[PDB]
Design a protein around this nucleic acid. Structure first.
Ligand SMILES: [Mg+2]
Ligand SMILES: [Mg+2]
Ligand SMILES: [Mg+2]
Lengths: 110, 132, 177, 205, 215
RNA sequence: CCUGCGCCCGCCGCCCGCCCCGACCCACGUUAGGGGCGCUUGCGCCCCCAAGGGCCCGUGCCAUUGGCUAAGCCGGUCCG
RNA sequence: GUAAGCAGAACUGGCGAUGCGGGAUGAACCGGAAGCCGGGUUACGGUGCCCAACUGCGCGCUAACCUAGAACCCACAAAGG
RNA sequence: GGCCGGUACCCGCGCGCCGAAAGGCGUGCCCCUCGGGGCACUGCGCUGCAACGCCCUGCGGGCUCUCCAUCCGACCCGUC
């Protein structure tokens, strides 16, 4: 903790991928569901509505010198009364992504 | 033995809803769930015990007392002052003040608190080594 | 704020008829959730009592009654007729509430809880602010004392708003009445 | 129940006097969202309904066995850790890869086996007995149920917990001593620094 | 009053007043001038086979991008993206193309005067007095790249030859940084602690909710 | 017991892979009660609602060249 | 006809020819009818987990030492205490 | 704040000036009469919105082909 190695500033709030917008017997892979760490209510996700996020994973082959990958997306609208958001990405996430971390920056700010 | 009762006079914090934080005097009891609460800024109204957190300040007043006598009794028992100096009543005020800090103020607070950490570290080391 | 019921008073009469071209005027004090529901319940009662149907009837006015002093607690009495699963019955219910409107909503919920009677089944015969020293019912009459005092045996712990709500709280809550 | 969203590497849960079903639904949603839990002191879980009702329920659960090969059908566990684990398996879809990977994150123990002794044990307010049952209704402890069902290690867990409790009493008195000395140290710095430290006064308590 | 602005703009009389048909009633008599037949080129070098379309001079005149209300020349901003993410800088003025123009100052943050998009910055409630700084010398051409030819591929031999040479930002930008840095440090020391503040970088340490955080 | 050309163990010079971004915090116990500090060991004082708190250079391009270095803090490592 | 997931009739609609959302599963029950896509909002049905939605805000009733009770059709229980 | 769209017509630009620019600037008649507001004479033409990036034989870009994983769906067809 003290004298640690890693990123020295976090300008992004963590979030967990939580699934897809799904009915009881359908999935709509176009939009994913995201839980932002620290947001608990429907009004507060109205602030993040717009602030883009990044799914950062890492593949097996090295391309452009790195295994790390990034898929880009943003918080479209709230999803429910408990601070869950719908996230729209450039290309739909893998189903394996649910449960993993996602970075939610503040770029399109105000 | 119980240390806090619902009875005519006792001021309670309002601990839920749009109106968090207000202090209200229980001027009457509707039934076993609801009460009449009155305040200097707010007109007397019914409000539920589940939305009332009672406090330790009581005021010696009538039943459903007139607004003027309720005010005069409230400063007679200096409820706002006593609440503010109470540790409980200071908790809410300090959380609002910490809510009000902007970035430069928060940076000055960080700098002020790092030196305090170093100071208490120095002092604790000295006193521990002092105590043989 | 918002009241689920309102007490209207509704005045109506039969259509003018070239025999007796001035029909008699009927006034009623109704409870309903809004104007159209009050009117629709009004024609119910005039059809089953005064033999007047809406088609051969005419609505003169609907007005909404409000409470004189919402800031004072009042002992209310409601004489009500209801339909059980096996017939009809007559009840008296006493409440304490700052408004007759809130007391009536209290009574509908209490009837739907104590007797599984839905609102389509309850007819409020009469409402009267039955002041104290005349209340017949234990639950109301036991709150008639100055120097009343009691604790909160049952109080929820819950963040003041939803924002403070966390799944994990390191410390056991401190409850004391 | 949406998920805590905390980023801890593991979350340790002091399951004493919590409700089996609700603690298990909260934990199940934590696991499905991906957070690794470790529920300890599982033997102390309170369950609504009398001990007699839970006894009768668990013996109905015992009669259920595959006729033509008993070893194949229901596997009736006895340890409180395993009974809770089965309960959470009830809420998790365990016939899918997501489901089995979900239960992989779940470690349930009786007592608090190290290295979970030297770890703050987080409780779940949404399931405490004090806040979830009305004081006066009959309930039972999962440990007392399992003892009466065929778990033969009740005495062992009692022995290990009495040892752990006294060993923690000693350390807590040590931290009382250290805390009073640190209180003295905080005032030592406070009366040493004046105007330099006013800024913390309106946000301190 | 966007609607009232729209009505006042849409009024016929005020459309006359804006398009300025008067003072076109000045030059060309007391009547509006005629137009003619320009473009007598009559020299087409090449005849395209498909229906001919010429290039567009965009006659549409976009509104300049608006600045935030909470941004005033003299604010301390928070960068968010790029290599300077988290750096706390000073907003000098909005340059003419629509982007913010910021300074570190370069002595303390290492962030020079640089162009940053308004999206990727957050206002802070703090202000500095920069009445005494000269900025008019700054414009878009100051930053216009004039990117060189794509015939240079950066190889291993160039990787550190560029680093060990100074064929980089030319010396007049160096010189510029000195004047702005001096003229703004003189006013930064007036505010206590602000030098340390700008030296720091903004980090979102655990238990910090941005929507809860003021700025 | 651990392969006579096989392997095990220690050191440091490092390349990678994986995790992560402060991936910091040990009371039991009841909740119609409890907690901390003092002395009649019973009585006082103060506090209890939520960790919603504490702690921590927390501030350096995961971090420029150098030099010195109190006290303190932390990491590795020896020993007990 | 004792009754029948029984036989024969009347008005209407459905299934057959029909997907789709809900009723756990069901041809005809509830909503609803359809080109392929993006966005928003709904019907029926729900918001503890499975499972997207609240362990939301209120008031009562129930304590089941019988598998307490928990969905229009519906998958039942009575007379009586 | 989301999704779509970016112009031959609705908008818009030029035929005057000031203004980096949003834009401001004329005359005459009605209204309040402060602030200013309303109305008006109206003509020729032209009329596909922009700024800046990344990469360009690359460990690049993307593929409707192949294998595999994961979430959701999903009973085996012809037939009486
Ligand atoms: Mg056929
Ligand atoms: Mg759609
Ligand atoms: Mg869900």
């Amino acid at each position: 903790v003290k004298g640690r190695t890693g990123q020295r500033v976090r300008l992004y709030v963590r979030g967990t991928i939580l699934g897809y917008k799904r009915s009881k017997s359908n999935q709509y892979e176009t939009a994913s569901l995201v839980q932002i760490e620290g947001v608990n209510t429907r009004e507060d996700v109205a602030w993040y509505g717009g602030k883009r996020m990044a799914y950062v994973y890492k593949a097996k082959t090295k391309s452009n010198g790195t295994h790390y990958r990034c898929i880009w997306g943003k918080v479209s609208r709230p999803h429910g009364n408990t601070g869950v958001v719908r996230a729209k990405f450039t290309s739909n996430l893998p189903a394996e992504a649910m449960g993993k971390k996602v970075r939610v920056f503040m770029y399109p700010s105000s | 033995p119980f240390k806090r009762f619902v009875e005519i006079g006792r001021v309670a914090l309002v601990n839920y809803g749009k109106d968090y934080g207000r202090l209200v005097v229980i001027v009457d009891v509707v039934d076993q769930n609801r009460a009449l609460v009155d305040a200097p800024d707010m007109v007397r109204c019914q409000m539920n015990f589940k939305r009332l957190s009672l406090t330790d300040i009581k005021i010696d007043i009538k039943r459903i007392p007139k607004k003027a006598t309720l005010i005069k009794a409230m400063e007679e028992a200096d409820v706002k002052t006593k609440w503010e100096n109470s540790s409980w009543g200071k908790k809410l005020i300090v959380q609002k003040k910490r809510a009000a800090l902007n970035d430069f103020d928060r940076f000055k607070v960080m700098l002020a608190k790092i030196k305090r950490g170093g100071a208490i570290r120095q002092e604790l080391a000295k006193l521990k080594k002092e105590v043989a | 704020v918002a009241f689920r019921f309102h007490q209207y008073q509704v005045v109506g009469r039969a259509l003018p008829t070239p025999g007796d071209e001035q029909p008699k005027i009927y006034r009623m004090k109704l409870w309903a959730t809004n104007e159209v529901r009050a009117k629709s319940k009004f024609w119910y009662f005039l059809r089953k009592l005064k033999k007047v149907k809406k088609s051969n009837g005419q609505m003169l006015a609907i007005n909404e009654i409000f409470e004189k002093n919402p800031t004072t607690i009042k002992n209310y009495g409601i004489w009500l007729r209801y339909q059980s699963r096996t017939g009809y019955h007559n009840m008296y219910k006493e409440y304490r509430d700052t408004t007759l409107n809130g007391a009536v909503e209290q009574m509908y919920t209490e009837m739907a809880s104590r007797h599984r009677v839905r609102s389509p089944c309850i007819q409020i015969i009469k409402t009267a602010t039955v002041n104290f020293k005349l209340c017949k019912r234990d639950n109301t009459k036991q709150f008639h004392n100055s120097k009343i005092k009691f604790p909160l045996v049952y109080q929820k712990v819950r963040p003041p708003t939803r924002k403070l709500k966390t799944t994990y709280k390191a410390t056991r809550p401190n409850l004391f009445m | 129940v949406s998920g805590s969203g905390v980023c801890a590497k593991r979350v340790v849960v002091d399951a004493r006097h919590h409700m089996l079903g609700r603690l298990a639904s909260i934990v199940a949603k934590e696991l499905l969202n991906g957070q690794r839990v470790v529920v300890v002191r599982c033997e102390e879980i309170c369950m609504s309904g009398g001990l007699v009702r839970q006894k009768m329920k668990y013996l109905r659960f015992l009669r259920k066995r595959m006729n033509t090969k008993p070893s194949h059908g229901p596997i009736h566990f006895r340890a409180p850790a395993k009974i809770l684990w089965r309960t959470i398996r009830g809420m998790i879809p365990h016939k899918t890869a997501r489901g089995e990977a979900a239960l992989a994150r779940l470690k349930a123990y009786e007592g608090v086996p190290p290295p979970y002794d030297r770890t703050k044990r987080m409780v779940i307010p949404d399931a405490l007995k004090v806040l979830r049952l009305q004081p006066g209704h009959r309930y039972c402890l999962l440990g007392q149920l399992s003892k009466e069902v065929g778990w033969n290690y009740a005495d062992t867990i009692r022995e290990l917990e009495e040892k752990r409790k006294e060993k923690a009493k000693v350390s807590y008195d040590r931290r009382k001593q250290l805390a009073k000395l640190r209180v003295k140290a905080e005032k030592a710095a406070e009366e040493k620094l004046g105007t330099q430290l006013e800024i913390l006064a309106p946000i301190k308590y | 009053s966007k609607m009232a602005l729209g009505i006042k703009r849409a009024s016929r009389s005020h459309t006359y007043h804006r398009r300025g048909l008067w003072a076109i009633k000045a030059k060309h008599g007391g009547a509006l001038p005629k137009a003619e037949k320009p473009a007598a080129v009559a020299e087409p070098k090449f005849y395209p086979a498909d229906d001919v379309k010429p290039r567009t001079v965009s006659t549409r005149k976009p509104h300049p991008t608006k600045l935030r209300s909470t941004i005033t020349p003299g604010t301390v901003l928070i960068l968010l993206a790029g290599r300077y993410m988290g750096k706390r800088v000073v907003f000098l003025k909005q340059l003419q193309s629509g982007l913010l123009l910021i300074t570190g100052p370069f002595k303390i943050n290492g962030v020079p005067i640089r162009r940053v998009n308004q999206a990727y910055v957050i206002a802070t409630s703090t202000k500095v007095d920069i009445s005494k700084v000269n900025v008019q010398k700054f414009d878009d051409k100051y930053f216009a790249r004039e990117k060189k030819t794509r015939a240079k591929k950066t190889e291993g031999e160039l990787f550190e030859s560029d680093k060990e040479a100074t064929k980089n930002l030319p010396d007049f930008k160096k010189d510029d940084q000195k004047v702005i840095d001096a003229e703004l440090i003189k006013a930064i020391d007036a505010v206590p602690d602000l030098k340390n503040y700008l030296g720091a970088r903004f980090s979102l340490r655990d238990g910090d909710k941005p929507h809860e955080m003021t700025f």
